[PDB]
Amino acid sequence: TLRELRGRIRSAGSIKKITKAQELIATSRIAKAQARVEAARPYAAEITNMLTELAGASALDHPLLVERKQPKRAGVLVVSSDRGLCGAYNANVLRRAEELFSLLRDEGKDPVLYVVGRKALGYFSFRQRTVVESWTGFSERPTYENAREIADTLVNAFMAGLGVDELHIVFTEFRSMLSQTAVARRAAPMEVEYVGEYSFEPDPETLFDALLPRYIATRVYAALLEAAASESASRRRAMKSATDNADDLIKALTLAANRERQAQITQEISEIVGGANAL
């Protein structure tokens, strides 16, 4: 009846305002997140230059550069949003996480799971696997003081070999505003790549052993900033989609509400005139 359709049009006409607002907000926050990525990049480029130049003089025998004799149990970090409305973002992450768990169990390892963000924590609490630790309330704006705690926990779990034999991260790479993907990569043990061809205080072995945990902290930080820029770009896309779906709904409901106006009037006129002609 017309009243239900007038109610559904009032409803959808409000949703279209709220989703068009969050498309415009997400269109600003991807510019703030890209500004923070490009501001964080200069540190990581210089730490890489310093780490390679130390590795050139070092023995290359730090625990994070040597594989275990028989690995059984691998650590994985998944990162995810603290809000909803993202669209595919959490699903793409969690499908890659399960695709990775089915790689690890196909090599013969079992995963132990660390989680960033309340959405993945909700998923790995519906499916019955444990979570070793988790962190929430910063995926919308990561700060290095969080990446520090994540890297310390993961590196202290690797260096305990309860303990783990490897470290992986699952996150999304922002490639461009129109395209991004979930990626899974091994953070530890690290591969050493020889390529064709200083003072150190107090020694190169000592600095290399004190620098690698700080490199791991900057690499997990760079991944968290890519995850937060990508979340906002996925939110923008999912909110443009929700606005265009609401605009097609207001159109279809209006084309139904008019057909019901016209039928109601014609039925009322048929009922009046049939009475007037009976007399």
């Binding site: 949703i15 409305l85 993202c86 669209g87 959490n90 699903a91 929700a242 709904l249």
Partner: protein, 114 residues
């Protein structure tokens, strides 16, 4: 259950409950897609969309239009198929596999090609 037996009736009630819960969510699905839903709902919708498609069949009459041959399935194979779909034994196959099949062996044969 007195005319069709319990092993039929339980399957027919479980399919209806799933398609009903999906037909209630259609108001949200139309705006926000699948990804907003809670996991107790998103599990259900992912088998509702497969049950919905698996109620399709390639009929003997349609052969003169599609060029595909027709299919008949016995009742016992129908009950065994929808019992496995509602429990979840086919949840990993893509939705596009389920169109115009017929029985379970044809489901397997089609799903192997995708």
């Amino acid at each position: 259950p007195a005319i069709v037996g319990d092993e039929h009736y339980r399957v027919a009630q479980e399919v209806i409950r799933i398609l009903q819960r999906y037909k209630d969510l259609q108001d949200i699905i139309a705006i926000l897609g699948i990804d907003e839903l809670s996991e107790e709902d998103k599990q259900l919708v992912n088998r509702a969309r497969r049950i919905e498609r698996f109620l399709s069949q390639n009929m003997m009459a349609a052969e003169q239009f599609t060029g595909q041959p027709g299919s008949t399935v016995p009742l016992k194979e129908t009950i065994e198929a929808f019992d496995k779909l509602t429990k979840g034994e086919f949840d990993h196959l893509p939705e596009q596999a389920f169109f115009l099949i017929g029985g379970l062996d044809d489901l397997a044969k089609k799903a192997e090609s995708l």
